[model samples]
Target: DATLTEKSFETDMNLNFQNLSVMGLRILLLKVAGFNLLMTLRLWSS
Candidate 1:
């Protein structure tokens, strides 16, 4: 099925961060965390 095929493709494309440089991963984590926190605060205050 089309849905099953898409799911399999997504699963295969998922990258393991363990293989990435530590600095890259740290920056990505920090950016995502900050964005999440900001969104949460904005939603709560609105």
Candidate 2:
């Protein structure tokens, strides 16, 4: 017999912007990647 376990977590993110320029686009992407990395590490640790 085998056993499986699962857990879940959630995060809420909100961003407000009047405009997005080239630099703003790059920053947004970097932020998103960092957020994903953080979430991944949290999940892996659990």
Indicate which candidate wins on lDDT. Answer: 1
Native-to-model Cα distance after best TM-score fit, residue 16 in candidate 2, in Å: 19
After superposing candidate 2, which stretches have Cα over 4 Å from the reference? 1-20, 37-46
RMSD of 1: 7.9
Which pairs clash in model 2?
A: none
lDDT of 1 by residue, 1-46 (tens): 3544443332323267644555566678779867896778777873
Give candidate 1's TM-score: 0.34
- Alpha-carbon lDDT of model 1: 0.60
Indicate the worst ten consecutive residues by lDDT in candidate 2: 9-18
In the range 1-46, model 2's lDDT, one tens digit per residue, is 6546544532223344523454576678779867896678777874
